[PDB]
Amino acid sequence: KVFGRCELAAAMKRHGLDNYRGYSLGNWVCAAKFESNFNTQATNRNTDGSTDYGILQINSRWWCNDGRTPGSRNLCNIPCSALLSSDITASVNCAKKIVSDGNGMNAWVAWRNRCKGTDVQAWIRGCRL
Ligand SMILES: [Cl-]
Ligand SMILES: [Cl-]
Ligand code: NA
Ligand code: NA
């Protein structure tokens, strides 16, 4: 599913991401835009052989099991395919674990390079939330 901007913002609010660990909703919407273009099906392979999955591009080395990333961990205890669903619950629950692991949203490269230090509230402007 390709979400609209305000549709995704509302879904992320419903799932508890607004101000989760101090990150306002616009940060999460901005990260999703640049990680996946709001597409739950997005996948991208990395040089080390791991793969990123879903709307927030969660990496199989650490967070999910895709059956082809040797020695990796499954810290969210889920198959990576679960992160491609039109229902964002599994992606959100896993992201909550990631953002709590000490490095905050700096774990998402696109957030650090394209959202951090910008007016992220613009990503939710105009939306009924
Ligand atoms: Cl959803
Ligand atoms: Cl933080
Ligand atoms: Na915001
Ligand atoms: Na893994």
Is the Cβ–Cβ distance between 123 and 9 less than 8 Å? yes
Residue the block writes with tokens 């599994």: 90
7 among known catalytic residues: no
Residue/partner pairs of 109-113 with CB below 8 Å, 24 or more apart: 110/31, 110/34, 110/35, 110/57, 111/27, 111/30, 111/31, 111/34, 111/35
Ligand nearest to the CA of 19: 3
Q: Which of 7, 18, 35, 48 is catalytic?
A: 35
What is the rounded CA–CA span in Å between residue 10 and residue 42? 20
Contact 84, 54 (CB under 8 A): yes
Q: What spacing in Å lies between the alpha carbon of 10 and ligand 1's midpoint?
A: 9
Q: Which two tokens stand for residue 78?
A: 């889920």
N residues, the chain: 129
d(CA 69, CA 118) in angstroms, rounded, equals: 34
C-alpha closest to that of 105 among 89, 94, 116: 116
Residue 101 in marked binding region: yes
Cα of 67 to ligand 2 centre, how many Å?
Answer: 31
| DSSP conformation class of 65 | B
Alpha-helical regions (H) of the chain: 5-14, 25-36, 89-99, 109-114
Ligand nearest to the CA of 51: 4
What is the Å distance from ligand 2's center to 125 Cα? Answer: 23
Q: Give the single-character DSSP code of 39.
A: B
Classify domain 1-129 by CATH number: 1.10.530.10
